[PDB]
Design a protein around this ligand. Structure first.
Ligand code: PLP
Ligand code: PLP
Ligand code: PLP
Ligand code: PLP
Lengths: 458, 458, 458, 459
């Protein structure tokens, strides 16, 4: 007999121990240690009772990479990117990713080492673009003898929350252009009506999270050129291309949205969305070195490479740089094109099957990013006992997360549902989702009384 | 450009391929092959959208073993148990497991190699016990000149479905003794009312699936001894101990339920329930060689071990034998006792926490197996808008399976919910479950209208 | 110095401990636990001193799958198939496998979800087929006013033992048709002579274990059609296709043996033999819903799939279902055909090389399954000092298991040896086997006195 | 027989008998076409060989070792995006529990069970959140007072880590720097108070100054600040940059009053990936109470009954580091952290003592409070030596070490120093290897007949 079996010795079974009769620590660090197997289970087991990543259809962020990328990134788990003197090959590799992304967006910059920065996501990449737009505007207004204490920026009401963070954390006024059924993306005319001498940039979005659509950057650029010629305000574009920045170059090469446009001075993207890398990657590029203020930035030479030093974070994992560069080499342009082709084709397939179901109507007939939204047919909704929130709950019973929500300004009465198709979500998985949607519809149509969310609508 | 990238060559990305734009085969084998990576994802990805095993609280069957048992079993995946001449060490190992189980049940058999058999689960083990009881009875009645064409057996209405399978597949009449609030387990007096000259055995259950309770085997044995003495019918007991066979020896050693009893001639158990082995293990033991008919069985000597050859299956995985022997050596009696103690303590803990909640009342104050059932307070239920089926659905939205069902005959008006606590379900996971139950109750109590199942009860 | 080193603490070396100076438990569970490393070695080390599976040439059961199938099945070790409500995707996958198998056997059933059942092997699949035949016959005779208490079935003496198990466990009389050199497979005329008003089915075998041959199912169907027309007895066929069920559709598609035949009402197969899945898989299909008695079976709808619930086992591993579906997708029809082609070609190669050896003659000139048997030339055997049993022992000295045995009734004086070629047994391994056979012959021919088995024959 | 496409990348291709491995890696543009996974794996992996191995990187404060279970747990969460809190609410709650544990390690008096704090990628984001909150609290006060709020400043030692310069640049807030001297080797409160005025949003003492390894005296700053605020009414607060010391002081110096026990310490930040013992990607910031986190910055959402404050500069990010932190808290507990930090500090103290015995070297401080320290050349030795600490850095790099040499901040900029950081996973045995290499390097450099470039640059 083993005296200390329950206390945690070499013979203890994890689930025959005193520790696994005790709660996990909520407030205070435990006084003493446990065995690695026990602590492993205590943390691991708490992650079971939630959505499985591959069935999270709310997220845009990568939930699958192949086994070689995964092994490569796991092996770099202890590499701190910012130690560039210690890890100069990764610093160079980061710069090469920046070059490749800038050239994917048709940068006219002549320098071999393109002007850009690594980010943890589009959040940091967006904030860097906006701070740069803010600093360029401050300098221009100062040289003109004009005030520079009340900056603002203009964006669709379909903005993603990081722009609200930017507005709050830097105390910059956000001006929002509302969505309507007639103007389902940012209308250039209405955005310009909200511009003045204090506007630091307009932010069109490629891959609006609420709708899956693309603001027309080319139409914005054309309108802005006329407006800037008339006012002299010299207002630029920063493209929030979080999703579309890794869709448009491969599937829509002739759509002019990027550094080909006169007024697009910076672009940001989520490398961990359709850049196909696990969580923790974003990129921001500037059209040239003259658009990244010296106040924000400096550059260091590593093994002949000019790597710009700009960022909100400092120490950070380096694994995502290896993952991105691996994808660029493993897939190339052709491979990126076929993977995004698959994701868009599957999104289009689900869109078409949803349109055939009696309760549903799609927000758009045009699927340009691998995601889309739909709502209840207005005539169907009036007499239905259920809402899209009830459908979300039914789908959750089978492990899916398919989110229902209200649309932004002036469409807020529309409850919609969104499906995002990422690499690793196949046609076969689409059929499973659609089968569960049909069954969920059949069960909810048997209801004799309205649900809580249905009553709230009336 | 790689011409065959989409068709499946060395450069193909699984989710940039034509195969992952196609549905999985429903009716016919595909005409041609795919890459192993593609096929692996196609099969694997279908298993995502269902209950995760460690959150499956309906099942009694093991969903966790430690890393060494798991590795041992994985390494034996290609070992066919039934090739005993080729794998005689595993045949002997099977015999040693049988000895250990039979002695765990206090067999008085003097032979070193105890009379018992390997099974895939309690289904086969129960059927073998029942077939043996049927053949012993047939032989007795024929020798007595009595008819033997209408056998029956007696069991609680809380029987598990394999006994209905046995009745159907062998055409033996099942006689069911009803459950009542007054007699919540098999009452011996009522069981004897259903015994006659054609009864081949009575089947008390240790670990009734519907209720979590134990039939009183000792009381049945006493009643049966008096009955057999007056009638000469010689009716035996077969104990269905699917769960309790690996609980009672460790936590209730002095409960006289096994071969210590005169009329207990066979006992069956699920090695994959509380025997702590992954799916695919059951055991059946007989009290002595004389209770296993020669018509059913023979034995072969492997390396000096006498291994009885009886079974419904033939070729089968051998991994579960290695797993069982590992558990016996790894844990021993003390280790089994500590693991089952934990599971029972967590079940009692949840049992006590459930009783404190306003909507609930427990079916029993006595928790003798690591599971229990509760129902709605009758006064609460009459005015509640929801039923336990609604609570089951709410819990499923967080990944749990906690089943609601109506109890067997004469308690069929009771809708109950059951929680089973297995090795690998910790106190921390119990708190997560109870927190989700509390949140679910709060949500259901906001309903203004009754649910479909609530209306169905009126 | 570490006081508890020998007792099993964190510093203990497995083979410097007291436990590894002690024998493994034969009769009783050890009182206390050990470390997982110690227990892992104690169980693992016992499996060393026996036949290695890839050198087991006696077994028909899969001993190799590729790395992806193996990982997929290992990852499902804790999934209990029978929890279909909890794991409905695996329940649907099971049904898809059944559809594919039935269509491989040319089922005319129009229902999308074909009538069949999952099994642990051909044992359960055969018994389910046999019980269904018994129940259909019982119902017919009852409707006719005829007795139904003495059923029989007809089979070759080349039956595999599960049919004797079936006869014993259900008390159904087995009538055996003898083998002769003139009639080396089931002779239909002799089979029909054993049919009467009490015959529930005739069982032809595809892949007779003793001989490697195929009973002629079509010839049986023809004779049975005329017999049923003249008697009205309506006697069916159940095909035991344990091996051939996954050989004939790919290599002999035009051989009429399956549901193309009028009287073939059910077929069984071992998915773990030439279905190419590790141990634990069988399938049985019925020609239509009307041939599966309602007394035996019911069906449940899972996500729109009609899954029949019939079986002898209940809880069981689900891994083998994933493995079967993986093989269907990974290989397709072409892939199955190429693997079985390789296995048959290697068997034919070994067959041709055996025929060139002076002591040996093949039982059949035609190799139709990836296995065959041979015996000693009668003139050579008479003056030889050794038998095939001695050759089996010599081969065992190099790790092979190549079994020698006497053939069934009327051929019982023929001692034969069998080789089975499974996936993972290459031409290179065949050359190693043949080299060991030649060397073994050379050694045995040096004997000056006869061996015990040679003396036993005289 | 021959395989026609062997060099082009087919099923038989050997990575290093292929055309692709005769070609350079892409510098400018994405390749037109794909390669096999093995080829791409080697092309990226092989570029990482020719640089410092993490466990020999003695410049970094950031974790380079966790045990196998923490590593496995974090690897298994590589595809979990923390910010999807509705989808992953158990990790959201787990994040909140980590924040609670950290806040209580720092003796927070907050009575709410769900402490006011935020997850970060490192001390950079946590420090900026602390500063933005200080900036916003100061703005709100001056606004209510009718006073101007358009020229904020903050006060910090010249030993600041670069993220505070980023904060100054990216938010256009004036950084006021207090110089270091041999007489005042850490932040002196009196000199700091001379740089405070009505526009100062906070003072930032540092626990674990990167340049020196020392701790600013927060308690002495708190006392001086209390007197100043009582006189002026400016209400200037403390934010402690405790990137390293935040996970040393509670375990090894529990009685040092540096945290929320102090009146004016309203927020504290730390790097979980330094001495919190988690791989790269973790920082934490806590506030002394909910009232010190402006609602303008923040909101909170209830997940499974837990109140999780939503504040941050990042959005989507790996969740693995949260599981790693919670694993370490449970696996080690208070005792386990104390023993690991004890080991790291003891080995730093050991190297410190052995460095002192060597003829060329003198230590900057006799007191080692964090598992790191700096030394420089003895002044009399330096004048006649032909080499500098940069030469010793280069020599050690030849054996794979990174041991950094650099000039100290303002008023000590003439001091070339070298720093050694001891992290979990750097043992006594490895310290013996480093010291043996240091001795051998000294012997070789003393053989020089002429000065090196960096020695001449000093003249
Ligand atoms: C994803 C998203 C963001 C935020 O980017 P993260 O990568 O989550 O930090 C910003 N804008 C848009 C349009 C987005 O889709
Ligand atoms: C589990 C169960 C059975 C069926 O056993 P399996 O292991 O699923 O084959 C029979 N009886 C009882 C009491 C059970 O709990
Ligand atoms: C294998 C075999 C059986 C028994 O099947 P298992 O898969 O071992 O259960 C029955 N019939 C034949 C012809 C066989 O080869
Ligand atoms: C590390 C460090 C920083 C920067 O923190 P990161 O975790 O690298 O972002 C800021 N202040 C101090 C004192 C530091 O040591």
């Amino acid at each position: 007999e083993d005296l200390n079996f329950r206390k945690g010795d070499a013979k203890t079974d994890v689930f025959g121990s005193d520790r696994m009769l005790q709660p996990s620590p909520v407030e205070r660090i435990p006084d003493g240690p446990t065995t690695p197997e026990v602590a492993y289970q205590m943390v691991k087991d708490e992650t079971f009772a939630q959505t499985q990543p591959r069935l999270n259809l709310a997220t845009f962020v990568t939930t699958y990479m192949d086994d070689y990328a995964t092994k490569l990134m796991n092996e770099a788990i202890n590499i701190n990117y910012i130690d560039e003197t210690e890890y100069p090959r990764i610093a160079v590799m980061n710069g090469k990713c920046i070059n490749i992304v800038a050239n994917l967006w048709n940068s006219p910059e002549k320098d071999t080492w393109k002007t850009g920065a690594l980010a943890i996501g589009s959040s940091e990449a967006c904030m860097l673009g906006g701070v740069a737009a803010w600093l360029r505007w401050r300098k221009k207004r100062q040289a003109q003898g004009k005030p520079f204490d009340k900056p603002n920026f203009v964006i669709s009401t379909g903005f993603q929350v990081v722009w609200e963070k930017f507005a709050q954390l830097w105390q910059i006024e956000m001006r929002e252009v509302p969505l309507t059924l007639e103007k389902t993306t940012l209308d250039p005319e209405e955005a310009l009506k909200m511009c003045d001498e204090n506007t630091i940039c307009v932010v069109p979005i490629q891959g609006v999270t609420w709708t899956g659509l693309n603001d027309d950057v080319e139409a914005l650029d054309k309108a802005l050129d006329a407006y800037n010629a008339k006012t002299g305000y010299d207002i630029p574009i920063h493209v929030d291309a979080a999703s579309g920045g890794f869709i448009l170059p491969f599937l829509y090469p002739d759509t002019k949205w990027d550094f080909r446009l006169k007024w697009v001075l910076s672009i940001s993207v989520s490398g961990h969305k359709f850049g196909l890398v696990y969580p923790g990657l974003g990129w921001v590029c500037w059209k040239g070195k003259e658009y990244l203020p010296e106040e924000m930035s400096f550059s260091v030479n590593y093994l002949g490479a000019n790597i710009t030093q700009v960022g909100l974070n400092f120490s950070r994992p380096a694994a995502q740089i290896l993952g991105q560069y691996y994808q660029f080499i493993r897939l190339g342009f052709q491979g990126y094109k076929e993977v995004q082709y698959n994701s868009l084709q599957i999104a289009k397939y689900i869109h078409g099957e949803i349109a055939k179901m009696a309760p549903f109507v799609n927000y758009s007939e045009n699927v340009v990013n691998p995601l889309f939204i739909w709502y209840l047919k207005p005539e169907y909704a009036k007499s239905a006992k259920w809402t899209l929130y009830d459908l979300q709950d039914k789908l959750s019973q089978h492990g899916w997360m398919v989110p229902a929500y209200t649309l932004p300004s002036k469409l807020e009465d529309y409850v919609v549902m969104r499906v995002v198709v990422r690499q690793g979500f196949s046609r076969d998985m689409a059929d499973m989702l659609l089968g569960d949607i049909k069954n969920a519809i059949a069960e909810l149509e048997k209801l004799d009384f309205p649900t809580p969310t249905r009553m709230a609508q009336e």
